Amino acid sequence: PKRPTTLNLF
Amino acid sequence: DNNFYSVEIGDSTFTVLKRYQNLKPIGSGAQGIVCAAYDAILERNVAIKKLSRPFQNQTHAKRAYRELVLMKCVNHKNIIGLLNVFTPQKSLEEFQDVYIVMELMDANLCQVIQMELDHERMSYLLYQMLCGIKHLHSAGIIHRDLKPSNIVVKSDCTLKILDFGLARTAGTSFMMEPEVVTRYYRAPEVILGMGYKENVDLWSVGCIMGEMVCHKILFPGRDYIDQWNKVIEQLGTPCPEFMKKLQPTVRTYVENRPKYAGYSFEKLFPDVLFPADSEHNKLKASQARDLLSKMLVIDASKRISVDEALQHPYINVWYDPSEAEAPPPKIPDKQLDEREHTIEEWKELIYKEVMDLE
Ligand SMILES: CCOc1nc(C(=O)NCc2cc(OC)ccc2OC)ccc1C#N
Structure with a gap:
C-alpha cells in the first residue's frame, strides 16, 4: 500500500 | 522602471x-x-x-x-x-x-470533485488534507473555512490547504460574523450561533469528502437559514441533549421545525458511489463511509477530531508520525481572538508587518 504519485488533473 | x-x-x-x-x-x-x-x-x-x-x-x-x-x-x-x-x-x-x-x-479540489478517484487517491488526498489541518489545530488555530475553493492539488497527487484570512483561534463568541464562512459547508455550531471547538473543521471536512463521492454539494441550501433544514433532512433532527445547548432564541426555532429521522449513511452514500472496493480491509467503502458518518455529526461534542481521523482505518494507512504529529507552530502573541484597533492603528501593524516580511 504505497502513496500514489500521479493524478490526471485533466 | x-x-x-x-x-x-x-x-x-x-x-x-x-x-x-x-x-x-x-x-x-x-x-x-x-x-x-x-x-x-x-x-x-x-x-x-x-x-x-x-x-x-x-x-x-x-x-x-x-x-x-x-x-x-x-x-x-x-x-x-x-x-x-x-x-x-x-x-x-x-x-x-x-x-x-x-x-x-x-488545480482546485473542484477539479478533483469532478472526476472519479480510487481508494488509493481519495484516501491519500484526505490524509494530506487531514495532516494539514492537524498542524493548524496543534496551535489552537481553527481555519473556519475549509472548502474546495481553498484546497489545491498538483499533478503529483498532493494537496495543500489555502487561505487564512478567516483563520483564527478561540471560540468565545458565537461568531458575530458567521455570515462569512461559505454556507454549504457551515458547521451546525456556526449556523446556530454556538461557539466552536477545533473540531468545527471536521464538519467541513465531511461536507467535502462527501462531495468527492456524491459529486454534488452535500447539503445545498438556498439561504443562510435553509442551510439548517438541509442538514436535518439528511442526518435527522438532533437530540434534546443538543437542543439544550442553543441560545434561548435559536433553541425555540430549532425546535419548531418538522422532525426528520434522516437517512442511513448507507443510503446517503450507497456503495456504488465509492471507488471500487478491492479485497483489502482498510481501503473499503465501508470504512470511507464510516469515517464520513463520524464527521457529519451535528453535536460537535460527539463529532470526531483530527487526532482520530488520522488514526482511522481509511486514512490511517499512510500515517507517519512526522506529517501526522509535526511540530506545533508558534505565533508570537500578537495573534489572539478579540483585540480591536482603529482603522489606522490596524493599518499601523500591517505595515510594520508587510515590512519585516518583505
Ligand atoms: C484560488 C486561487 O488562489 C490560490 N490558488 C493557488 C493554486 O495553486 N491554485 C491552483 C490553480 C492553478 C492554475 O494554474 C496556474 C489555475 C487555476 C488554479 O485553481 C484556482 C495557490 C494560492 C492561492 C492563493 N492565495
Whole structure:
C-alpha cells in the first residue's frame, strides 16, 4: 500500500 | 522602471516587483484577485494575491493581519507556503495595498470533485488534507473555512490547504460574523450561533469528502437559514441533549421545525458511489463511509477530531508520525481572538508587518 504519485488533473 | 510595475489585471490593476511575469488571473474571490505568475528570480511559477480593501473595516484589518501573521508563523508540506509579501507604496502615508506571494499547485479540489478517484487517491488526498489541518489545530488555530475553493492539488497527487484570512483561534463568541464562512459547508455550531471547538473543521471536512463521492454539494441550501433544514433532512433532527445547548432564541426555532429521522449513511452514500472496493480491509467503502458518518455529526461534542481521523482505518494507512504529529507552530502573541484597533492603528501593524516580511 504505497502513496500514489500521479493524478490526471485533466 | 522604479523596479515594480503594473499590469491591467482584468477588472483592476496590479503592481509587483518586476520579477513576476505574465500575470494571468485564476482567483476571483471575497478577498481579492489572485493570479498566477512566473517568478523569474525563482525559476518556478507562483501565485500572487492582492488583498481587496484591507482596511475597509476594522474587521478586514483584523483579518488581513491574521492572514499575514498566520501565513508566516505556520508551515507544513500540506499548507500553501508563503513565498513572499510586498507592497509598492513607499511609506505608511501611501501604504494601503498589499500583495502576498505563495507557491502554486495545479488545480482546485473542484477539479478533483469532478472526476472519479480510487481508494488509493481519495484516501491519500484526505490524509494530506487531514495532516494539514492537524498542524493548524496543534496551535489552537481553527481555519473556519475549509472548502474546495481553498484546497489545491498538483499533478503529483498532493494537496495543500489555502487561505487564512478567516483563520483564527478561540471560540468565545458565537461568531458575530458567521455570515462569512461559505454556507454549504457551515458547521451546525456556526449556523446556530454556538461557539466552536477545533473540531468545527471536521464538519467541513465531511461536507467535502462527501462531495468527492456524491459529486454534488452535500447539503445545498438556498439561504443562510435553509442551510439548517438541509442538514436535518439528511442526518435527522438532533437530540434534546443538543437542543439544550442553543441560545434561548435559536433553541425555540430549532425546535419548531418538522422532525426528520434522516437517512442511513448507507443510503446517503450507497456503495456504488465509492471507488471500487478491492479485497483489502482498510481501503473499503465501508470504512470511507464510516469515517464520513463520524464527521457529519451535528453535536460537535460527539463529532470526531483530527487526532482520530488520522488514526482511522481509511486514512490511517499512510500515517507517519512526522506529517501526522509535526511540530506545533508558534505565533508570537500578537495573534489572539478579540483585540480591536482603529482603522489606522490596524493599518499601523500591517505595515510594520508587510515590512519585516518583505
Ligand atoms: C484560488 C486561487 O488562489 C490560490 N490558488 C493557488 C493554486 O495553486 N491554485 C491552483 C490553480 C492553478 C492554475 O494554474 C496556474 C489555475 C487555476 C488554479 O485553481 C484556482 C495557490 C494560492 C492561492 C492563493 N492565495
